Design an enzyme around this catalytic site. Structure first.
Site, PDB file in Angstrom:
ATOM      1  N   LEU A  25       0.840  -1.185   0.000  1.00  0.00           N
ATOM      2  CA  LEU A  25       0.000   0.000   0.000  1.00  0.00           C
ATOM      3  C   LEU A  25       0.883   1.245   0.000  1.00  0.00           C
ATOM      4  CD1 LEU A  25      -2.574  -1.292   2.609  1.00  0.00           C
ATOM      5  CD2 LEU A  25      -2.799  -1.323   0.140  1.00  0.00           C
ATOM      6  N   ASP A  26       0.258   2.414   0.115  1.00  0.00           N
ATOM      7  CA  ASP A  26       1.008   3.661   0.198  1.00  0.00           C
ATOM      8  C   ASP A  26       0.388   4.531   1.287  1.00  0.00           C
ATOM      9  OD1 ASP A  26      -1.295   4.168  -1.277  1.00  0.00           O
ATOM     10  OD2 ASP A  26      -0.370   5.812  -2.392  1.00  0.00           O
ATOM     11  N   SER A  27       0.844   5.784   1.349  1.00  0.00           N
ATOM     12  CA  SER A  27       0.452   6.671   2.438  1.00  0.00           C
ATOM     13  C   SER A  27      -1.047   6.937   2.431  1.00  0.00           C
ATOM     14  CB  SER A  27       1.227   7.984   2.341  1.00  0.00           C
ATOM     15  OG  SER A  27       2.385   7.837   1.545  1.00  0.00           O
TER      16      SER A  27
END
Ligand SMILES: CCCCCCCCCCCCCCCCCC(=O)OC[C@H](COP(=O)([O-])OCC(O)COP(=O)([O-])OC[C@@H](COC(=O)CCCCCCCCCCCCCCCCC)OC(=O)CCCCCCCCCCCCCCCCC)OC(=O)CCCCCCCCCCCCCCCCC
Ligand SMILES: CCCCCCCC/C=C/CCCCCCCC(=O)OC[C@H](COP(=O)(O)OCCN)OC(=O)CCCCCCC/C=C/CCCCCCCC
Ligand SMILES: CCCCCCCC/C=C\CCCCCCCC(=O)OC[C@H](COP(=O)(O)OCCN)OC(=O)CCCCCCC/C=C\CCCCCCCC
Ligand SMILES: CCCCCCCCCCCCCCCCCC(=O)OC[C@H](COP(=O)(O)OCCN)OC(=O)CCCCCCCCCCCCCCCCC
Ligand SMILES: CCCCCCCCCCCCCCCCCC(=O)OC[C@H](COP(=O)(O)OCCN)OC(=O)CCCCCCCCCCCCCCCCC
Ligand SMILES: *P(=O)(O)OCC(C)(C)[C@H](O)C(=O)NCCC(=O)NCCSC(=O)CCCCCCCCCCCCC
Lengths: 125, 104, 103, 87, 220, 164, 67, 80, 178, 128
Positions: free
Chosen positions: D41-43
């Site tokens: 995932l990312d931020s």
């Protein structure tokens, strides 16, 4: 609310009546023989019944009868329909009398306007 | 202190102050119970203009409605005994000017 | 971005200590060691005391103390209507005149 | 008033939400999985996960603390410590 | 004697009773909320009775039971005006308070100070009854300020909440502006009529002027 | 002065009410609007209708506040209609009680609030009053209906929005 | 009675509360219909409102313009 | 006691306004991954809810029947 | 709340906080779940559109314009959780929080009412008193000569030690004390 | 574009809209570091005193002591009679007194004139 406000404000205030000055014509002006209103309840009767000063109008006898009917049949608070209707009907008749007074004032004012316009036209011509 | 951060671990959580940091001269009036200077969604000038406009318009319209009242096409109400002369505290000795209401 | 190893370790130790503290905060089966020293009946005792005694005291106070000085208790005089029987003197207040009945 | 929370209940609910996430494969999701090192995932995805947990448990996680919750076990520990759960 | 005065004063007194029992083991126990609710129910019925008495024959009374003090030509006494307004508003308020107290028994079960909450609710009810049945301006002002301070104490129920404290103080501020108006009206009435009671105020003020009526309007 | 103050109060408070999201705030503004209507009733020289409305308002407004409190307690101290929903079937009795209370507040033709509010409006229209005060009273009645509908719609109708 | 919490599901209801809510809603509607049947004048009015334009100048006591 | 969470596979956005949202987003070229987590709200006992007019008329059917019966009984009593 | 703050917020932290705030206010505007999901997907689409941007000056300008747009379009009355600082249930139980130092001023009879609790309390007090010197020594060994450059504290580096400055964090009042 | 927000003294400018928030000089970062260092030093001192088990009493706050001293006992030694202070003092301490004197004197003169002319409604004014 009504059309009379529109006529008086967005129209001819001179032809429309003024509620705070009405009546401005004599009561017998146009009535040959006019009968004075009859009062059934006496001052002593109204004073004893302790009717509020707003309720001591010409329909006071029906109000007194309604109060007497309500007091006697206390637990049954639905047994004074006839007296209530009589009082309401007398109030309705008083209100239509007031409406007749307003209408008479209005058409007397407009008749006066027509008469004075006719007199001015005759004087000019 | 309302503008101060609520999620920080202040030494004094209710006042939102730290121990030893300099105290504003007007801390007594800038506490959370008193004058709030936090930003608002609408500009202060816009809020003042709108509030003043609303109140001034309402006052003006109240005066206009006062000089153009609302009523019904009816004449004055009638009362039997000289418009209830004695009932309203009139003097029994003096004779009132008669008031007569006729049928119509 | 994330916990540093020192932050992770300190948080783990603190959480363990906090959980042990809460478990200690739990009570005991015998813990609150106290020092040595029908429904109709309750409502009946309540009704006689709370309602009967005050009404007795107040009625006694009003009948023999308050209503012993002038004008302390003033009742609005009863309304008298036409065709009535005043009981004080056996008086008959007469009926009103014949109404001009409509419909 | 309400029934008390438990560590197992908190863990079950956080894993329930994460399995209802579409970007996370339910089979490989464990309580020690990292949201970025091993979940990919990312931020923004982590922000959405934190917001979902806030909606789930009915309380707000401050942004200073929510940025560091990079693991379901970390989320469980944080929520348990904030709600005073010890069992 | 006519039961009217006895029953009205009895309702007021039995409202005041559970405050006296607030220094007892019953107040230390958990039966106090139910005790207070039962007292309010009994007061409600005992107030319903004089309402029936009024709706039959239109009975109204004033009761100047206790004389407080005579400021030369002005007499202040503890007087209650049991008229249509009072005998119609007391049962309604008691009914509403009874329902609210049962709802609060359900609703405030987890509060450590539910007994204090019920004592405060009863105190507000007592002050409101005093305000409604007051016959003179000073007793009316007593009830006025009493309901004001009870509102202050009950709004700020959670003392640790700064918003609650601000709300309580704001309510006090606005009610104190109202009290400014009230005191203006009281001073005018006493100065120009030598009376603080409704009977003499109405007798002497056949055309009440703008200053006292605007004071009353500001208070309201 | 009493009539004008009551008119502006009822109008302004209803206008603020129709767009609030806290249910207690909505009910508080409804209370303020009803008080403004009572002050209007006093200003047109109808003191007894004001007392009648006082009694009726006490009844149905107390019930409305109790219903909102039950909703708040059942939803874990949540006071936002944005997070309420589905309560029409979730909570039957409080739902029917709140619907009855809203119908009484808006003057359902034969409920408790009909015997006071209808008479008050009739007296306002038929009296020698301020035109602007009359207009504001009518608009305030419409906005009363509006915010009662807002409460019902955002609290009981639709899909749940509360925590699972 | 003890009502167990539900997770992501419709809460458990009771026959008592169901029947009570239905009874009170039915009571309100019966009362409204019953009162409208008996005294409908409280809503629709009771006495007709006169039309002033239909009142004759003779009965209002207005003389002809020339007179 | 010890409530059990229902199986997580049952939550789907099909037959739910969430699938309409998903179709709009697909037309836009996007997707929302939180469909099912919100889709618990649109199923079960929450699937059907009355309208505003239906809510007001909660007890009209029984109330009208009782009103008809009472009017008939009153009419019969008045006649006899 | 539990994490020591930093000196400044980086660009990533700023944009993430803006993203969360915008999502919350958008949820406030879009009451219903389907509408909120639609518009939240569109919002994340905008963020992803600007996600790849090598120019930090342009990225900062985009952040500034986004903040102005948010301030203009924010909800006047956004949803706040009850326990959150703006919430209605905020600070409600602060009057019920009593500390353990207040606990130790009890009368001997009151203390005798809870015989088992106070034994464990005495054990905790002994544990606290036996570790303070080690805690202060550890703190003063690891500090720079200039002083603490941040508000973070070290863990317990030894087998028998406790993390320095732990007493009040460990013994803080429960969130629902009474 | 969007309407701008104008800050006031009672509605200040939000941090997100402050222009200096998006123009960070390298010296700004070191200023922030120094501020954080000062805060951390003070926090460490307060926490050590707070968690000291042998401390009984109140942790005296030098900042609070300075504030209470500067609010009261430091005002007069640092006051100088300036045109601004003199005008403000004269206004705020004399103008209200004479304004109220004029108001009350005028009102009482009118009342006494009415009393002397004998056309003031003083009936029932028994209490004075
Ligand atoms: C009981 C309840 C409470 C009751 C109330 C209690 C409190 C209120 C009452 C007390 C109020 C204060 C006390 C009275 C004033 C005392 C001033 C004083 O001692 O100053 C010494 C103080 C120290 O002297 P300094 O060190 O040589 O000068 C330092 C200055 O900073 C440097 O000075 P500068 O060179 O900058 O000055 C420029 C300018 C500064 O003055 C101004 O700006 C004031 C402007 C208005 C002045 C008056 C205008 C009209 C003048 C002509 C009138 C003609 C009438 C015919 O000067 C002038 O205008 C010339 C002098 C004007 C007349 C002064 C009379 C004394 O000097 C000043 O403060 C300078 C200004 C003094 C006058 C200020 C205005 C006073 C108004 C009084 C109204 C009554
Ligand atoms: C008769 C003379 C008085 C006339 C009016 C003068 C008003 C003087 C104002 C009082 C001075 C203030 C001193 C300190 C007050 C208490 C401290 C304080 O300011 O707290 C502010 C407190 C908290 O703010 P919140 O909105 O609740 O936000 C909470 C966020 N968590 O709010 C307040 O209480 C402010 C109240 C000030 C009122 C000012 C305006 C009053 C209106 C008066 C004019 C209206 C006249 C009415 C006409 C009636 C017609 C018959
Ligand atoms: C308690 C239960 C006691 C059990 C036995 C019951 C006793 C019944 C017999 C009653 C006692 C005899 C009695 O009451 O005598 C009257 C006696 C005094 O005689 P006065 O005529 O008033 O003399 C003038 C004084 N300035 O009155 C009393 O002492 C009883 C007072 C009870 C009244 C209510 C108590 C007052 C509390 C309010 C505090 C003051 C509020 C200020 C009021 C403001 C009004 C403008
Ligand atoms: C909709 C906008 C309406 C705007 C109305 C503006 C004011 C109209 C006006 O001035 O009307 C004249 C007069 C009242 O005017 P007056 O109160 O004397 O004040 C004048 C000072 N500007 O009013 C009149 O002459 C008409 C008086 C009617 C009285 C009706 C009964 C009382
Ligand atoms: C600066 C000028 C005003 C100065 C006083 C107010 C200052 C502001 C602070 C007010 C603080 C509370 C005190 C309020 C006192 C109000 C007194 C009042 O209304 O007096 C009515 C006044 C005199 O009426 P009166 O003499 O009784 O009757 C004969 C007809 N003139 O009748 C009149 O004056 C005629 C006009 C009636 C409407 C006046 C409204 C005043 C409202 C004041 C309170 C506002 C808050
Ligand atoms: P993760 O660690 O992958 O995060 C990626 C980040 C964002 C950190 C990037 O690495 C990054 O910094 N990229 C470059 C800078 C950047 O992307 N900036 C974008 C921020 S502003 C932007 O362009 C999107 C803002 C648009 C939306 C603004 C909101 C306004 C409406 C709010 C209304 C509120 C109620 C509806």
């Amino acid at each position: 609310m009504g059309a009379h406000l529109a006529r008086r404000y967005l129209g001819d205030a001179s032809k429309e009546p003024d509620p705070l000055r009405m009546p401005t014509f004599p009561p017998d002006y146009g009535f040959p023989e006019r009968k004075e209103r009859e009062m059934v309840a006496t001052q002593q009767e109204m004073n004893d019944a302790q009717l509020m000063l707003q309720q001591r109008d010409y329909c006071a006898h029906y109000l007194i009868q309604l109060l007497k009917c309500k007091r006697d049949s206390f637990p049954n608070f639905l047994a004074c329909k006839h007296e209530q209707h009589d009082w309401d009907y007398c109030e309705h008749l008083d209100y239509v009398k007031r409406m007749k007074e307003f209408e008479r004032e209005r058409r007397l004012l407009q008749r006066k306007k027509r008469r004075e316009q006719r007199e001015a036209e005759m004087a000019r011509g | 202190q309302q503008e101060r951060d609520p999620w920080y671990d202040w030494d004094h959580p209710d006042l939102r102050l730290n121990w030893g940091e300099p105290i504003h001269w007007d801390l007594d009036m800038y506490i959370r119970n008193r004058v709030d200077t936090s930003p608002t969604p609408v500009s202060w000038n816009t809020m003042c203009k709108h509030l003043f406009g609303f109140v001034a318009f309402m006052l003006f319209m109240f005066w206009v409605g006062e000089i153009y009242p609302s009523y019904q096409p009816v004449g004055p109400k009638q009362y039997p005994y000289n418009d209830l002369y004695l009932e309203r505290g009139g003097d029994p000795t003096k004779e009132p000017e008669p008031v007569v209401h006729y049928e119509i | 971005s994330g916990y540093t190893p020192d932050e992770k370790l300190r948080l783990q130790q603190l959480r363990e200590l906090r959980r042990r503290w809460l478990k200690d905060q739990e009570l005991s089966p015998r813990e609150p060691v106290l020092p040595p020293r029908y429904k109709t009946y309750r409502h009946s005792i309540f009704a006689v005391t709370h309602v009967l005694i005050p009404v007795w005291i107040i009625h006694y106070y009003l009948k023999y103390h308050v209503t012993a000085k002038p004008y302390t208790v003033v009742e609005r005089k009863p309304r008298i209507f036409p065709g009535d029987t005043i009981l004080e003197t056996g008086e008959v207040i007469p009926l009103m005149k014949e109404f001009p009945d409509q419909h | 008033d309400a029934p008390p929370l438990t560590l197992e209940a908190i863990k079950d609910r956080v894993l329930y939400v994460l399995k209802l996430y579409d970007k996370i494969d339910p089979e490989k999701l464990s309580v020690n999985s990292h949201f970025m090192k091993d979940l990919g995932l990312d931020s923004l995805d982590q922000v959405e996960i934190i917001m979902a947990m806030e909606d789930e448990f009915g309380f707000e996680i401050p942004d200073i603390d929510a940025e560091k919750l990079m693991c379901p076990q970390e989320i469980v520990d944080y929520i348990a410590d904030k709600k005073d759960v010890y069992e | 004697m006519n039961p009217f005065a006895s029953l009205t004063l009895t309702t007021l007194t039995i409202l005041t009773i559970p405050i006296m029992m607030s220094n007892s083991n019953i107040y230390k126990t958990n039966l106090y909320p139910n005790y207070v609710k039962t007292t309010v129910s009994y007061a409600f019925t005992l107030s319903l009775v004089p309402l029936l008495m009024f709706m039959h024959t239109g009975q109204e009374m004033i009761i100047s039971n206790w004389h407080w003090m005579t400021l030369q030509t002005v007499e202040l006494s503890l007087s209650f005006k049991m008229d249509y307004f009072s005998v119609m508003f007391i049962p309604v308020a008691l009914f509403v308070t009874w329902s609210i107290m049962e709802f609060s028994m359900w609703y405030m079960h987890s509060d450590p100070f539910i007994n204090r909450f019920f004592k405060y609710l009863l105190l507000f009810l007592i002050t409101m009854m005093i305000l409604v049945t007051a016959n003179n301006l000073f007793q009316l002002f007593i009830g006025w300020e009493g309901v004001g301070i009870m509102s202050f104490l009950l709004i700020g129920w959670w003392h640790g909440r700064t918003d609650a404290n601000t709300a309580a103080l704001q309510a006090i501020l606005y009610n104190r502006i109202g009290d400014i108006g009230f005191v203006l009206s009281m001073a005018w009435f006493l100065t120009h009529s030598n009376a603080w009671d409704l009977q003499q105020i109405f007798m002497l003020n056949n055309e009440c002027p703008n200053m006292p009526l605007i004071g009353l309007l500001l208070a309201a | 002065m009493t009539l004008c103050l009551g008119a502006i109060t009822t109008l302004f408070t209803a206008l603020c009410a129709i767009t609030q999201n806290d249910i207690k705030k909505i009910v508080a503004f409804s209370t303020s609007s009803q008080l403004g209507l009572m002050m209007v009733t006093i200003g047109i020289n109808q003191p007894h209708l004001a007392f009648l409305h006082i009694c009726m308002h006490a009844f149905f407004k107390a019930m409305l506040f109790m219903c909102s409190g039950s909703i708040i307690h059942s939803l874990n101290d949540e006071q936002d209609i944005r997070k309420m929903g589905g309560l029409y079937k979730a909570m039957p009795f409080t739902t029917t009680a709140l619907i009855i209370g809203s119908l009484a507040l808006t003057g359902m033709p034969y409920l408790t609030g009909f015997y006071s509010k209808d008479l008050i409006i009739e007296a306002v229209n038929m009296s020698y009053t301020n035109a602007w005060a009359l207009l504001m009273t009518l608009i305030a009645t419409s906005l009363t209906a509006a915010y009662s509908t807002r409460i019902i719609f955002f609290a009981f109708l639709g899909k749940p929005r509360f925590p699972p | 009675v003890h009502i167990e919490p539900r997770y992501r599901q419709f809460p458990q209801l009771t026959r008592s509360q169901l029947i009570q809510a239905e009874f009170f809603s039915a009571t309100m509607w019966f009362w409204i219909l019953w009162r409208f049947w008996h005294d409908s004048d409280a809503v629709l009015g009771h006495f007709p409102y006169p039309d002033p334009s239909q009142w004759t100048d003779e009965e209002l006591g207005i003389l002809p313009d020339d007179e | 006691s010890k409530m059990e969470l229902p199986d997580y596979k049952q939550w789907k956005i099909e037959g739910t306004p969430l699938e309409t949202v998903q179709e709009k987003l697909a037309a836009r070229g996007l997707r929302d991954p939180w469909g099912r987590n919100e889709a618990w709200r649109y199923s079960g006992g929450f699937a059907n809810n009355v309208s505003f007019v239906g809510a007001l008329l909660k007890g009209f059917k029984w109330g009208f029947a009782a009103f008809v019966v009472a009017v008939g009984a009153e009419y019969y009593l008045e006649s006899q | 709340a539990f994490s020591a703050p930093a000196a400044y917020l980086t660009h990533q932290q700023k944009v993430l906080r803006l993203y969360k705030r915008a999502l919350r206010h958008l949820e406030s505007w879009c009451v219903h779940r389907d509408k909120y999901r639609y518009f939240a997907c569109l919002m994340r689409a905008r963020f992803d559109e600007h996600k790849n941007e090598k120019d930090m000056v342009k990225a900062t300008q985009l952040l500034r314009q986004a903040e102005e747009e948010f301030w203009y379009g924010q909800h006047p009355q956004p949803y706040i959780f009850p326990e959150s600082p703006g919430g209605t249930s905020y600070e409600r139980y602060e009057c019920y929080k009593v500390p353990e130092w207040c606990l130790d001023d009890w009368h001997p009879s009151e203390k005798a009412m809870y015989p088992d609790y106070f034994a464990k309390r005495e054990q905790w007090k002994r544990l606290r008193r036996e570790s303070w010197e080690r805690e202060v020594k550890q703190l003063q060994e690891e500090t720079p000569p200039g002083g603490p450059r941040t508000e973070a504290l070290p863990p317990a580096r030894k087998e028998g030690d406790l993390p320095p400055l732990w007493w009040h964090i460990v013994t803080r009042p429960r969130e629902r004390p009474m | 574009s969007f309407p701008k927000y104008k800050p006031s003294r009672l509605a200040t400018l939000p941090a997100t809209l402050d222009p200096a928030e998006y123009d960070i000089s390298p010296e700004t970062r070191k200023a922030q570091a120094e501020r954080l260092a000062i805060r951390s030093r003070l926090k460490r001192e307060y926490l050590l005193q707070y968690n000291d088990p042998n401390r009984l009493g109140v942790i005296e706050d030098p900042a609070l002591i300075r504030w209470t001293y500067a609010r009261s006992a430091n005002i007069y030694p640092n006051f100088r009679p300036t045109p601004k202070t003199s005008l403000l003092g004269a206004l705020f301490g004399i103008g209200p007194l004479f304004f109220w004197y004029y108001v009350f004197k005028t009102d009482r003169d009118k009342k006494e004139k009415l009393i002397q002319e004998g056309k003031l409604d003083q009936t029932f004014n028994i209490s004075y």
